[PDB]
Amino acid sequence: ENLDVVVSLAERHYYNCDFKMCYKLTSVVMEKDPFHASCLPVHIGTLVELNKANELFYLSHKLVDLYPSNPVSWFAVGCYYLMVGHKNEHARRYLSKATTLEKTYGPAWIAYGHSFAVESEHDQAMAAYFTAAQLMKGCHLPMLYIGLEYGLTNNSKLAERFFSQALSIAPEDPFVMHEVGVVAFQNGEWKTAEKWFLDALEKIKAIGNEVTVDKWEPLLNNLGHVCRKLKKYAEALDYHRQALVLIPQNASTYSAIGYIHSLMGNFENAVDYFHTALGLRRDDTFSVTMLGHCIEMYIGD
């Protein structure tokens, strides 16, 4: 009947990104104590990662019916409006309703910042992550996100600090490696972008293999950008093809593929991809300006 030992192992499959397992570890604990304060924050995250929009919908809104005192309940419903939305304005409103009900409730500070971090409000997301890193010490996530937010803002030297701190905790985290190559890429260091993206893929692929592709696809899109940038056009195309199998209605991947062709000199075939990308995203600032180069040249045979 002693179950706090579970919430350690289930917490380990969440940091090492083995979600399928962690979830069946928590539903065990959860089958006992649903209002488990230290386990709930975990089983809530795993639904989100797995895309249990269904479970999380029922759960999140229940906790609020019969437990409007525990901050976990607005962390829940907030995490709900974050994975789906786009009631973004709501999320921040619920998650702040948990901080101002127990400011020492770290989990709501990480979800809070994630709400600024998606709307681009870097100053304010940042501040939230630095409050979470105080409330959730030893946890590497808050540090993975301040590092990234630094990278986005040209703090490549402070970005490198928190990436390596987060790596010396959960070194086997594919989302850690990911945002590191992601930042390298922005620095113009395409070469070392290729190596971090590949590494995050072998660990996502063969290792923690289970088709974590849910709520996900990027990685492959990203790799395709690297190889184009590395003039590896031939290897580039390949990665976008697979990003489409994963998300067969993505317009950005169609613009990325048509742009490679135009770098390759295949205009007839490129403009073909530049059409079937405005068919999806009409406001394609880049597909549109490029399509203009392609025709000025058609007027000239």
């Binding site: 969440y14 990480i110 994630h114 946890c139 996100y145 990234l148 989302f175 880049f286 300006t289």
Partner: peptide
């Protein structure tokens, strides 16, 4: 414990340089 979708790369306009350098050269 909560994560935000792996940052996805998107095309900037500055990226059109690659195509610029392709003919300017060739």
């Amino acid at each position: 414990m909560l994560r935000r979708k792996p940052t996805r790369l998107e095309l900037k306009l500055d990226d059109i340089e690659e195509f610029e350098n392709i003919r300017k050269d060739l």
